[PDB]
Amino acid sequence: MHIEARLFEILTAFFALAAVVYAVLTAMFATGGVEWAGTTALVLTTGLTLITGTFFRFVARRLDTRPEDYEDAEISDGAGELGFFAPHSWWPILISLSFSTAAVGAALWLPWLIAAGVAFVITSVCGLVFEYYWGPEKH
Amino acid sequence: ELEARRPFPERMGPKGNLIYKLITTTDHKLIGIMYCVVCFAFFLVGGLMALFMRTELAMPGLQFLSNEQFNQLFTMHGTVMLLFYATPIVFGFANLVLPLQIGAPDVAFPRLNALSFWLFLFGALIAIAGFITPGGAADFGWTAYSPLTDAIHSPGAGGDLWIMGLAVGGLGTILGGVNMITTVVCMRAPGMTMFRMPIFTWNILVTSILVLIAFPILTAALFGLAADRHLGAHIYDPANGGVLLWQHLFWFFGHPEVYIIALPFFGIVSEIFPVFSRKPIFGYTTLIYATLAIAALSVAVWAHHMYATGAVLLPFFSFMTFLIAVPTGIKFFNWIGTMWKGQLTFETPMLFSVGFLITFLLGGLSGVLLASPPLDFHVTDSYFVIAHFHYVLFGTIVFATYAGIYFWFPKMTGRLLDERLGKLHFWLTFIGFHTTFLVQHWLGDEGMPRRYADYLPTDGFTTLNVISTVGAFILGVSMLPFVWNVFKSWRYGEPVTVDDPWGYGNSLEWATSCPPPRHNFTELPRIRSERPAFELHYPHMVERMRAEAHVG
Amino acid sequence: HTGVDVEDVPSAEWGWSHMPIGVMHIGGLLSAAFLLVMMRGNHVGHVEDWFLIGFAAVIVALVGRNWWLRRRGWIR
Amino acid sequence: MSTALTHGLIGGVPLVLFAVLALIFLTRKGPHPDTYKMSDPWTHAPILWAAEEPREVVIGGGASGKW
Amino acid sequence: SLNRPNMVSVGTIVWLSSELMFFAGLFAMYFTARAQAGGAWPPEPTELNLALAVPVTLVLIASSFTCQMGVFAAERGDVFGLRRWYVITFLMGLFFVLGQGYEYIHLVEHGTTIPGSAYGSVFYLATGFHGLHVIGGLVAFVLLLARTKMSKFTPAQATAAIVVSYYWHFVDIVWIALFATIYFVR
Amino acid sequence: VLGLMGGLLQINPIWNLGPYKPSQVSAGSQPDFYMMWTEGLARIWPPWEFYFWHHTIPAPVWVAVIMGLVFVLLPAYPFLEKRFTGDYAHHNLLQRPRDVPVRTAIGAMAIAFYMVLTLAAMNDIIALKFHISLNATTWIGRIGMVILPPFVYFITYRWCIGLQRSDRSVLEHGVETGIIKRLPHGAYIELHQPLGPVDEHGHPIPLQYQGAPLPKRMNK
Amino acid sequence: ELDLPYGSALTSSGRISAVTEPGELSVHYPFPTMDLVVLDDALKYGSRAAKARFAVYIGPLGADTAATAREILANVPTPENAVLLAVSPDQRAIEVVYGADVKGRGIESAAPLGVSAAAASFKEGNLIDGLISAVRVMSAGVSPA
Ligand code: HEA
Ligand code: HEA
Ligand SMILES: CCc1nc2ccc(Cl)cn2c1C(=O)NCc1ccc(N2CCC(c3ccc(OC(F)(F)F)cc3)CC2)cc1
Ligand SMILES: [Cu+2]
C-alpha cells in the first residue's frame, strides 16, 4: 500500500515541525520557560504517526501489486477465498458487563467489587479467545 | 409474463425474531440501527434537562429549582449531549454505510464491533446513574476545571461515577476507531483505488485517526484525577503546576473532539448534495486536501480556550486558528459550486442540508470573530460563546443527522418516510432553533455570564430570556412529528421495490437491493470512477461525463 | 394442546406454548389496581405517588392498546 | 414581567404555531394514487397476488358468475 | 482475495500507537511538577537504589531476544520451540515484576508514599501503570500457550504469536524510555 | 471444598457480638440467606391493619398468609399443570427448557420475585455501601415486587421462541463455518456445512427436529 | 436486448437494477393501504388454515374466460395445490379455478358460495371488499389435507 504510507508521512512531517516550533517559541517569549505539557503531547503524537507510517512503508516495500492498489483491474482478479469472519457470538456483552462491574467498583471505593470485576474480565476474555479453538468433548 | 407478488409487504415479523438476534449479532447493519436508537433516547434525556434549565432561567427568582440542582442540570446536559449522543452516532453512521460504500462483506473485526457498542451503552448508564444518589450527579462544569473537582471541593459520589463512565465510553470509542481504520485499509473491492472511494469514507478514516490521537490522553488524565480523589495523590495541586496542567491536557483532548464530531457530517452533506443537484461533486481532490488540512491543524490550536488565564503564548494559537479558518472556507465554496447551475429538487434531505449550510455559516462567522484575543477578553465565559457553539453543534449534528436519516432510511429498511411530516418537522425545527438562540448574542454581550442559575430584576435582560425559553419549548415540541413518522413508516409506509429510490445516486450502495442481503452484495459492477452506480444505471453518460469534466 | 400454530412457535407439539390472553389483560389491570391502592396510609410525602400513578397509567395504556388492536383485527 | 402572561406565551405560542404549520402542510395531497372506482374502466396493468404461506397444470374444478 | 498484508497486524499496530499516546499523558504529568520543585527536587527521604534497577532492566532486554527467538521458531511450523521460548520469556518477565514489587516495598518502607509527596505520586503513578501493562502481557502469554495446546497448528496461531511478540517489544522499549528518564536524567 | 472454605473464610463470629439482652440492638439484623425472603416480605409490605369491635388484626398476619400460600403452592404444582394443560401420559424423556416457553417464563418470573424479596432484605447494607437513600430502596422494592415479574415473563417467552428459531435455521441450512468467498461475478457466500444428505444441486435436504441439541460451532 | 425503460440495467447476474425519480413510488396500486393490508392477512391466514395457496387476479379475460383463467393459474408457484380467483371488471366476469391436488377437500361446495358473495359485494362497487369476502368464505370452506 503506497498512499496510506504517504498520508502518514505527511502527517508526521507536519507534527514534528509544529512540535519543534512550539518548543523553541516557548523556550523564549514565555512566562516560565518551556511549557512542558503541550511539548510532550506533540512529540509523542509525532511518534504515533511515525510508527504507523514506518510500518506501512515496510509492508509496501515488501509487497507486490494488489488488485485494490492497482487500477486497470477487473473483478475476476479478486476471485478467491477471503479470511474467516466470525458469525454470531455472545461473549462481547459479558466482557462489557464485567468491565462495567469493575468500573463501578472503582468509582465507589469497594475493593471486593474490583477483585470480582477483574476475575470476571479474565474469565470472559478467556472465553472470547478460546471460542473457535475448543475441540470436541472427550467423554 | 405475470409474476406473483404480495398485496403489501409484511409489517413486523414473527414472534421471537429479534431479541436473541440482538444479543449475539455481529453484522454491522443491526449494530448501526442499535446505535441510532439508543443515541436518540439519550438525545431526548439531554433535551429534557435543557428544558428544565430554560423554564427556570425565565422569570427572575428561584421558582422551583435550587443552585445545586441547576449546576447538576447543566453539567449532565453538556456531558450527555456531547459524549453519549454525538460520538456514538458517528460510529452508527459508519457501521451503517461504510462497508457498503467500499464494497466489502463485513467489517475487519466483527466481534470488537459489538464489544464497542456494549461498552458505550454500559458506560453511559453508569455515568447517568448519579441522579439516584441522594447527593445528586456531578455538579462541576462539563469541563471539570482544575481544583474544583478535587476531593475537598466536590466531595459527592457523583463525580466518581462521572469519571468511570467516561473512561469506559472512551475505551469503546478507541476500539471502534481501530476497527474502522483497519476496515478501510484492508477490506476493499478489487477495482477501486483510494482515490475513487467516496468522501464519507475519507472523512471517517481521518476522524478515526483523530480519535486514536485524542482519547487515550483523556483516559490518562481521568486516571490521574481518580488517583488524586481516592488516594490523595498531589497531582493537580495549585502548589505545583497543577491548575494549568489539567487545562492543557483537557483541551488538547477537547478540541480534536469537536472536530471528530464535525467532519463525518461534512461528509454526509457532501454526499447528499450531488444526488439532488444532478451534478458531480465539485473539486474532489480539493475536498480531500481540505479534510487533511483541517485534521492536521486541529491538534495545534488547543489553547485558544485559555486566553483569560494569562498563561499562554497568544500570537501562536491566535494565528493558527485564523489559519484553520481557511480549509472550511474552501469546503463551503466547493459545496456551493456543486449546487451551481444544476436541476434542484428540494426533498427533505436537501432541505435539511441547506439548513445546515446556513446555520453553520453563521456559527463559523461568530467563531472566527471569537478567535481574536482582545475580543475574547470581553465575550469569553458569556452567552456569546453559548450561542456560537450551539450554532455550530446544532447545524452540524442535528441537521446533517436528520438529513442522513431521511436519506438512508430506505437503504436500511425498504420503506419510505413521509414527506409532508418531514417538511413540517423541518420548518418547526428551523423556526424554533433560530428563535431560541439568536438573542443570546445580545444577551451575553451586555454582561450576563454563563452558568448562572439566578439574576436580579434590577438587571436588564429579562425579556430576552423569555424569548429564548419560548424558542426552547418550540424546539421541544418539534420532535413529535419525527418520532411519529418513524413509528408509522417503519411498519406501514410506501415500500421500495427498486434500487436507488433517489434516482441519480452514487457510491456503490445504491447498486444493491434496497434492504441489502447478508454480506451486502450479490454482484459488483466494474469500477472506473467515483460514481459507479451512476455509470451503471446510465451507461449512455460516460462519454459526456469524461468529455466535459473540466470546463468549470 | 389447546392450540397455537407452528409458524408462530416452531416447537408447539413438544411442550406447553399457549396462555390465554384474558389472563394477561386482567392480570395487568389487577396489578395496576394494586399499585394505585398501595398509596393508602400516606406517610408524609408525595414524591412516591407520582411514580405510582405514572407506572399505573403506563400499564393501563399498554393493556388498552393491546385490547383495542386485537378487537379490530390488527393482531391475528 | 406579569407572570401570568409569561406562562401564557410559553404555553400558547408553540401549540398555535404547530396548528398553523399542520394545517398548511398536513392537508396536501400525497403521492399515493387515488382509489379506483369501478364505475369507470380499468386501465392499470394486470395484477396477480399470491399467498406465499406454505414454503417448499391439471385443473380440478371451476365455477363462474357474471355479477 | 486474501490481500497478503495481514489484518491482525494492522489492528495491533494502530492500537499500540494509541497506547503510546496514553503514556504520553503520563509523561506530561511527570515533567510538570519537576520544573516546580527547585534544587534537590527528589526530597531527602528518597534514594533510588541503582544496584537493583539495572538487573531488572537487563532481564527485560534479554526477554526481548527470547521472544524474538520464539517468533522465529513460530514462523516455521513447529510448536515445541515456540512453547520453550515463550515459557522462558514468561519466567523472566515474572522475575522482573517481582523485583519491581520488591523495590516498591523497600522504598515505601522508609520514605516515599503516594499521599506523602508529589515526587512519590508521579513516580508511583508512572511505574505502576507500566507494571500493569507487563502483567497484561504475561496473561496474554499464558492464553496463547493454552490455545496452542488445545488444537492444531495453523497460520492463525503464527499470526497470534507474532502480534503478541511485538506488543511485548513495545512494552519493553517504553520501559527503556521510562528508566532512562527517571533514574539517569533525574 | 467445604474444608477449604471453612478454614479460610469466617462465618458467624459470635464473640464480636454480645450475649442477648432485650435492651440493646445493632444495625445489620439479617437472617441467613434462606430466610431473607421472609424478612424482605415483612419489610416491604404496607401497614394495613383492621380494627373492629374490641379486637385487632395486625400487619404480620399478611406475612403469615403469604408464606403459607407459597408453601402450599409449591407442592401442588404438578396437579395444577396437569389440570390446566390436560396431559396425563407417562413420560420418561425430559424436555429442553426452550421447548416449553410458558413454564420457563413462569419459573423465571418466580425466580425474579424471589430475587427481589431477597435483595429487599439487605436494604441497610445496599444503601450504605452504594450511596442510595433508604426510603428509596424501600419504594424500589415495593414497586419492583409488582413490575419486575411480568417484564421478566415477557422477555423469557420471547427469548425461548428466539432460541427455537435459531435451532430451526441450522436444521434447514447447514452449520455456518464463517468462511467467505467472492464468486468471480462479485458475490459473497458463506460456505455452510450440511448435517445430512444433499440434493442434486448441492443444497442439503432439511432435517426434522428430534428434541436434541444441535451443533453451532465447526470446531465442536 | 430488451428495452430496459430508462434506468434499468442488466447486471452480471440475471438481476435487473431499476431506479425511480425522487418524487414517485414503485407500486401504483389504485387502492388504499389499509385495505391492501386486510386483503393480505385474509390471504395469509386463510391459506394457513387450509394448506392451499390462495391467489387473486384482476386483469382482463378477453377470451374464453375459463380457458384464460386456467392459463393464468400456471403462474402460481405450486399451481397443482392452489386456488385462484379471477375477476375482470370490464367484462364483469368471475372465475374460480382449482388444482388437481386440492380436491376432495370440500372445494366445489364452496366455490359457488364465494362467487355469489363476490358478486353480491361487487354489485355496489366494492372491489377489494368483495375479494376479501370471497377469500374469507372459500378459505373457511376448504379443509386441510
Ligand atoms: C462542532 C463544533 C465546533 C466547531 C466546528 C467549532 C469551530 C470553531 N470554533 Fe468553537 N467551540 C466549540 C465547538 C465548535 N467550534 C465548543 C463546544 C466550544 C466551547 C465549549 C466550552 O468551552 O465549554 C467552542 C469554543 C470556542 C472558542 C473559545 C471560546 C472561549 O472563549 O471560551 C473559540 C475561539 O477560540 C472557538 C473558535 C472556533 C473557530 C475559530 C472555529 C472554526 O472552526 C470555524 C471556522 C468556520 C467558518 C464557517 C468560516 C467560514 C468560511 C468562509 C465562509 C470563509 C470566510 C473567511 C473569513 C471571514 C476569513 N470555539
Ligand atoms: C451536541 C449538543 C448540544 C445540544 C444538541 C444542545 C441542545 C440544547 N441546548 Fe445545550 N449545551 C451544550 C450542548 C448541546 N446542547 C453544551 C456543551 C453546553 C454547555 C455545557 C456546560 O456549560 O457545561 C450546553 C449548555 C446549554 C445552556 C446553558 C447552560 C448554561 O447555563 O450555561 C442552554 C440553555 O440556555 C442550552 C440549551 C439547549 C437547548 C434549548 C437545546 C435544544 O437543542 C434541545 C431541545 C430538546 C428537546 C426538548 C428534547 C425533547 C424532549 C422532550 C420531547 C421531552 C421528552 C422526554 C422524554 C420522552 C424522556 N444548552
Ligand atoms: C419477619 C421475619 C424476620 N424479621 C427479622 C429481623 C431481624 C432478624 Cl436477625 C431476623 N428477622 C426475621 C426472621 O428471622 N425471619 C425468618 C422467619 C420468619 C417467620 C417465621 N415464622 C415461624 C412460625 C410462624 C407461624 C406459626 C404457626 C402458624 O400456624 C397458623 F397460625 F395456624 F398458621 C403459622 C405461622 C410464621 C413464620 C419463622 C422464621
Ligand atoms: Cu476558558
For residue G56, report the phi and psi dihedrals to the nearest 5 degrees: -140, 130
Do the Cβ atoms of G13 and D17 come closer than 8 Å? no
Centre a 10 Å sphere on the Cβ of residue B407 and count the other Cβ atoms it contains: 27
Euclidean distance between CA atoms A50 and A54, whole angstroms: 6
G96 DSSP 8-state letter = E
Q: Quick count: other Cβ atoms within 10 Å of Cβ B212?
A: 25
Q: Report how far residue B396's alpha carbon sits from residue B264's, in angstroms, rounded to the nearest whole number.
A: 10
Q: Is the CB of F64 under 6 A from ligand 3?
A: yes
d(CA E55, CA E59): 6
* Phi and psi torsions of B234, nearest 5°: 50, 35
Rg (CA), chain B: 24
Outline where chain G has alpha helix (H): 33-48, 65-72, 111-122, 127-141
Determine the Cα–Cα distance for residues E171 and E89; give it in Å rounded to an integer: 13
Strand intervals (E) in chain A: 81-84
What's the G57 CA to ligand 4 centre distance in angstroms?
A: 72
The per-residue b/e assignment along G114-123, b for 16 or more CB within 10 angstroms, e otherwise, is bbebbbebbe
Residue G83 CA to residue G54 CA, distance in Å, equals 5
H and E: helices and strands count for chain A: 4, 1
Interface test with F, best of B102, B161, B508, B522 (most F CBs within 10 A): B522
Residue D17: domain span? 1-67
The three three-digit cell numbers of residue G41, written as one number: 392477512
Residue whose CA lies nearest to ligand 3 atom number 21: F64
Measure the CA–CA gap between B280 and B273, rounded to whole angstroms: 9
CB atoms within 10 A of CB B27: 22
In a domain, E2, yes or no: no
The answer for residues whose C-beta is within 8 angstroms of residue E165's C-beta and 6 or more apart is E67, E68, E70, E71
Closest CB to D49 among B7, B58, B494: B7
Q: What is the DSSP string of B183-231?
A: HHHTS--SS--TTSS-HHHHHHHHHHHHHHHHHHHHHHHHHHHHHHHHH
Please give the resolution of this entry in Å, rounded to 1 decimal. Answer: 2.7
C-beta of residue B107 within 8 angstroms of C-beta of residue B176? no
Residues of chain B contacting residue E18, judged by C-beta atoms under 8 Å apart: 174, 178, 212, 215-216
CA distance F176 to F217: 8
Rg of chain E, C-alpha, whole Å: 19
Axis-axis angle for helices B86-102, B263-277 (nearest 10) = 50
Are B324 and B256 contacting, i.e. CB atoms less than 8 angstroms apart? no
CB contact under 8 A, B14 and C9: no
Chain F touching partners, 3 or more CB pairs below 8 A: A, B, C, G
Would an 8 Å CB–CB cutoff place E50 in contact with chain A?
A: no
Question: Coil, strand or helix: which one is B41?
Answer: helix
Q: Which residues touch B387 (CB under 8 Å, ≥6 apart)?
A: B366, B437, B438, B440, B441, B444
Phi and psi, residue B5, nearest 5° = -140, -165
Local structure of residue B303 (DSSP, 8 states): G
CA G123, distance to chain mean position in Å, is 19
The residues pairing with G96 across neighbouring beta strands, listed in sequence order, are: D63, G85
Look at strands D62-65 and F192-193 and give their pairing.
unpaired
Q: Is the distance from CB of G119 to CB of G137 less than 8 angstroms?
A: no
Cross-strand pairs, E62? none
Q: What is the DSSP letter of B522?
A: S
Structural domain harbouring B253: 18-548
Closest-CA distance of chain B to residue F135, Å: 11
SS3 A61: helix
**What does the alpha-carbon distance between residue F159 and residue B18 come to, in Å, rounded to a whole number?**
9
Q: Which chains sit next to C, with 3 or more Cβ pairs under 8 A?
A: B, F, G
- Over its C-alpha atoms, chain C yields an Rg (Å, rounded) of 18
Look up residue A17 and give its amino acid. Answer: L
In a domain, B13, yes or no: no
- What is the distance between the alpha carbons of residues B135 and A108, in angstroms, rounded to a whole number? 14
Q: How far, in Å, are B369, E181, F60, F139, G126 from residue F44 at the CA level?
A: 61, 61, 11, 8, 61
Could you write out the DSSP letters of every residue in chain C?
-----TTTSS--SSS-----HHHHHHHHHHHHHHHHHTT-S--S-SHHHHHHHHHHHHHHHHHHHHHHHHHTTS--
What is the separation, in whole angstroms, between the first and last Cα of chain F? 31
**Residue E177 contacts A, CB cutoff 8 Å:** no
Please choose, from the candidates E16, F197, F213, B179, the residue with its C-alpha nearest in 3D space to the C-alpha of residue A86.
B179
CA-based nearest residue in chain F for residue C58: F147
Q: Give the list of residues 6+ apart from residue F126 with CB closer than 8 angstroms, or none.
A: F119, F132, F137
CATH number for the domain harbouring residue B282: 1.20.210.10
**Would you tell me the crossing angle of helices B28-57 and B67-83 to the nearest 10 degrees?**
150
Q: Which long-range contacts (CB under 8 A, 24 or more apart) does B449-453 make?
A: B449/B381, B449/B382, B449/B383, B450/B381, B450/B382, B450/B383, B450/B385, B450/B386, B451/B71, B451/B74, B451/B141, B453/B56, B453/B57, B453/B62, B453/B65, B453/B66, B453/B67, B453/B70, B453/B71
Nearest Cα neighbor of B348 from B398, B392, B265, B405 is B405
Which ligand is the nearest neighbour of the Cα of B263?
1
SS3 B84: coil
- The rounded distance, in Å, linking the Cα atoms of A88 and F170 is 13
Please count the CA atoms within 13 angstroms of the CA of A91 that sit on its side-chain side.
19
Q: Which amino acid, A111?
A: P
- Please provide residue B147's backbone torsions phi and psi, each rounded to the nearest 5 degrees: -95, -10
CA distances from B412 to B103, B180, B397, B405 (A): 16, 20, 20, 10
| B115–A92 C-beta distance less than 8 A | yes
Dihedrals φ, ψ of F60, to 5°? -65, -10
Report chain B residues whose CB lies below 8 A from the CB of C8.
14-15
d(CA A80, CA A78): 6
Give rounded-to-5 percent helix, strand, coil for chain G. 35, 15, 50
Residue C30 touches chain B, beta carbons under 8 Å = no
Q: Ramachandran region of residue B398, left (φ > 0), alpha (ψ -120 to 50) or beta?
A: alpha
Question: F186 in contact with G at a CB cutoff of 8 Å?
Answer: yes
E95, three cell numbers: 522475575
The CATH number linked to E104 is 1.20.120.80
Phi-psi region of B507 (alpha: psi -120 to 50; beta: other; left: phi over 0): left
Write phi, then psi, for B156 (nearest 5 degrees).
-65, -175
Which atom of ligand 1 is nearest the CA belonging to B379?
31
Whether residue G19 and residue B345 make contact (CB cut-off 8 A), yes or no, is: no
Q: How far apart are CA G109 and CA G100, in angstroms?
A: 16
* Burial per residue of B271-305, b for 16 or more beta-carbon CB atoms within 10 angstroms, e otherwise: bbbbbbbebbbbbbebbbebbbbbbbbbbbbbbbb
Give E4's contacts in chain A (Cβ within 8 Å).
Answer: 63, 66
Cβ neighbours of residue G78 closer than 8 Å, sequence gap 6 or more: D54, D56, G53, G99
Strands lying side by side in the sheet with G93-97? D48-49, G53-57, G82-88, G93-97, D62-65
Q: Which of B308, B204, B320 minimizes the C-alpha distance to B255?
A: B320
Residue type, F120: A
Q: Are C7 and G51 in contact (CB under 8 A)?
A: no
Q: Is residue E87 part of a domain?
A: yes
Taken as a whole, chain F contains a residue count of 220
- Could you tell me the maximum CA-CA distance found in chain A, to the nearest angstrom? 77
Instruction: Find the CB nearest F182 among A80, A86, A87.
Output: A80
Sequence-distant (6+) residues with CB within 8 A of B361 are B332
Counts for chain G of helices (H) and strands (E), in that order:
4, 3
E strand or H helix at D40 = none
Q: Do chains C and A touch (3 or more CB pairs under 8 A)?
A: no
C-alpha cell at A97: 458487563
Helix axes B420-436, B463-477, angle to 10 degrees: 160
Which whole-number Å values give the CA distances from B409 to B304, B495, B500, G24, in the listed order? 39, 11, 12, 16
In the block, residue with C-alpha cell 517489544: E169
Q: Can you tell me whether residue G87 is helix, strand or coil?
A: strand
> Of chain E residues 17-46, which have a CB less than 8 A from chain A?
17-18, 20-21, 23-25, 27-28, 31-32, 35
Could you give the angle at the alpha carbon of B426 between the alpha carbons of B423 and B428, nearest 5°?
105
Separation of alpha carbons B219 and G133, rounded Å: 67
CA distance C61 to C55: 10
Picking from C17, C20, C21, the residue whose alpha carbon sits closest to that of residue C5 is C17
Residues 6+ apart with CB under 8 A from G91: D66, G60, G61, G62, G65
Distance CA B244, CA B304 (A): 14
Quick check: B189 and B102 in contact, CB under 8 A?
yes
Strands G53-57 and D48-49: antiparallel
C-alpha to C-alpha distance for G38 and C76, rounded to whole angstroms: 11
Helix, strand, or coil (residue F57)? strand
Q: Which residue has the cell 441537521?
A: B399
| Portion 21-60 of D in contact with G at CB < 8 A | 31-39, 41-42, 44-54, 56-60
Location of C-alpha cell 426434522: F208
Cβ proximity of B225 and B163 under 8 Å: yes
What distance in Å separates the CA atoms of residue G69 and residue D65, rounded to the nearest whole number? Answer: 13
The CA distance from B152 to B274, in Å, is 57
* Protein residue closest via CA to atom 24 of ligand 3: F64
CB atoms within 10 A of CB B399: 27
Report residue A38 CA to chain centroid gap. 22
- Answer whether E34's CB lies under 8 Å from A112's CB: no
Query: CA nearest G14 in F: which residue?
Result: F185
Is any Cβ of chain C less than 8 angstroms from the Cβ of F46? yes
Task: Please name the method used to determine this structure.
Answer: cryo-EM
Task: Give the span between the Cα atoms of C31 and G39, in whole angstroms.
Answer: 38
* Number of independent structural domains in chain D: 1
CA neighbor of F178 nearest in space, from A94, E158, B26: B26
Burial (CB count within 10 angstroms: exposed 0-12, middle 13-18, buried 19+), residue E39? exposed
Q: Measured between alpha carbons, how far is B228 from F145 in angstroms, rounded to an integer?
A: 41
d(CA E99, CA E102): 5
* Residue whose C-alpha is closest to residue C73's, from G37, G134, G118, G138: G37
Residues of A with CB under 8 A from a CB of F: 75-76, 78-88, 108, 110, 131-136
Q: Report which of B511, B515, B537, B539 is spatially closest to residue B523, judged by C-alpha positions.
A: B511
d(CA E88, CA B108): 33
For residue E161, the enclosing domain spans 7-185
Contact D50, B4 (CB under 8 A): yes
> How many angstroms separate the CA atoms of F85 and E42, rounded?
81
- DSSP, collapsed to helix, strand or coil, labels residue F203 as coil
Residue E1, in any domain of the structure: no
Q: Indicate if the alpha-carbon torsion angle A22, A25, A31, A34 is positive or negative.
A: positive
* Nearest residue to B529 via CA among B543, B515, B513: B543
Asked if G72 contacts G66 with a C-beta cutoff of 8 angstroms, the reply is no
Burial of B242 (0-12, 13-18, 19+ CB in 10 A): buried
Q: Which chain B residues touch E132 with a CB distance below 8 Å?
A: none
| Dist CA A36 CA A26 (whole Å) | 9
Determine, for residues A129 and E4 on separate chains, whether the beta-carbon distance falls below 8 Å: no
Q: Which neighbouring-strand residues pair with G56?
A: D49, G85
Chain D neighbors of B424, CB-CB under 8 A: 21-22, 25-26
Q: Are strands F175-176 and D48-49 parallel, antiparallel or unpaired?
A: unpaired
Q: Please choose, from the candidates A100, A127, B460, the residue with its C-alpha nearest in 3D space to the C-alpha of residue D1.
A: B460
